Amino acid sequence: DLSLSDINSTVEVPEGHSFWKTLLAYSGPGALVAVGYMDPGNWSTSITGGQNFQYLLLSIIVISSLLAMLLQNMAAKLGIVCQLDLAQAIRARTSRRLGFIFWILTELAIMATDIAQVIGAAIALYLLFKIPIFLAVVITVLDVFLLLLLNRIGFRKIEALVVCLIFVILFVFLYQIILSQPAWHQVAKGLIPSWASVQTSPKIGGQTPLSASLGIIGATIMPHNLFLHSAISQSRKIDRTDSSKVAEAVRFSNWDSNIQLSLAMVVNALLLIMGVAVFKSGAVQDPSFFGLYQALSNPDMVSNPVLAEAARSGVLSTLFAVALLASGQNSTITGTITGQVIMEGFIHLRLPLWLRRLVTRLIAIIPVVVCVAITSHQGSLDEHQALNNLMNNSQVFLALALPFSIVPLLMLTDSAAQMGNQFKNTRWVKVMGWLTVIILTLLNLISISSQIAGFFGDNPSSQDLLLSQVISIGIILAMIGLLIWTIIDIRRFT
């Protein structure tokens, strides 16, 4: 009846005021959440953002991460104080049909992330081991056994394995930056919140600073990682009777989550400066993983003789594909955990990790093998580009399931009927939290029309455009109705 019954309140190791060892104990949840924010689904968008705007968008990244650190912490709080995840709170404060709508929506979000990671991992196999593109996908389907071995290890080593992947993809991209020797003064100048990133005048590569900045801000959080954080935050036993120990617990999970999401921010920065210093100006013409592979393997694309010799040897591209692999291993863990959370929390369905990863992976790979089937039917022409367009088109479900995950979180944590007058949010995080939630909801509701119109490709059929407008209006209006309904129920609880 409690979230993550297998590993809920497992190891509690606060030992008086020995704070840093205590920090070493529970440092796992923050990493499990942060590794999701390093998935390849936006890697190109960073590199592109670096080529179109050298170091300019870095500050935006920071801001985004900060916002991601805020809401995530809130989620952790809901897990630590209430001893129940976000899905159990929402489902407990609304009917079953709303919990079912939220269930299918979040399932579609984690399904979208799973699509990004199966595409990135399959391509990673196509680049490293030269496995055929169609075989690499059905090889990625075999991650259920890696989940079976993953199940017997334990969170003290699983949550450290996630750290291992994090520093793998962090040191892979940091190594290519160390060889690049970039002008770190311009990097520092770019990290400052300047007003050149909010303008619309450069328009390099069909992208203005305000478009890229609002895109980075719009994709701030992932809805599934909120339920994930609220669930894994409970894995540390708390008496819930001593205010100093639960306040200490909040400091604990906060410093952990910031320590890891800061690493994710560092990875995004390494991707932007990867697009600025490593690649030449405008050298990246194919945002696909294969385009970045050949671009990292062509000496004329880099801006340094050392990177030209190393690129000719073929080490940059292989490290890139290794980073694709280490990033593609995330949904096997966080996808199954979060899927269990929303499943047994929203619809009260107890399913094993076997059929979970089976169903999610199959539903994820169906459109992938359809895309590879059509493109390979065209002669393997534009197959990687179409895989990239599938990966980017999949991210609409996140915008569909974002407000129904950030609004109920902020409401339930701001109310005293769930947190109490002692552990509710400060008047500071009320203003910042509501501002962030409003901005993200508006920006994603704007993104719905752009992505739905993007489903029809870069060929604008005049009759299909109006249909995209009708479908977009219907979707955003339906999300408005669901949003005001959830607002009404939660505000009826408070």
Numbering used by the authors: 13 to 506
Sentences from the paper on this structure:
conserved and function as secondary active transporters. transport proteins that include the amino acid transporter LeuT18. μM range and that metal ion transport is coupled to the cotransport of protons. of the prokaryotic SLC11 transporter EcoDMT.
mutants of Glu129 and reduced to half in H236A. different role in proton-coupled metal ion transport. does not function as primary H+-acceptor. the pKa of Glu129 would have to be shifted upwards. in vicinity to the metal ion coordinating Asp51.
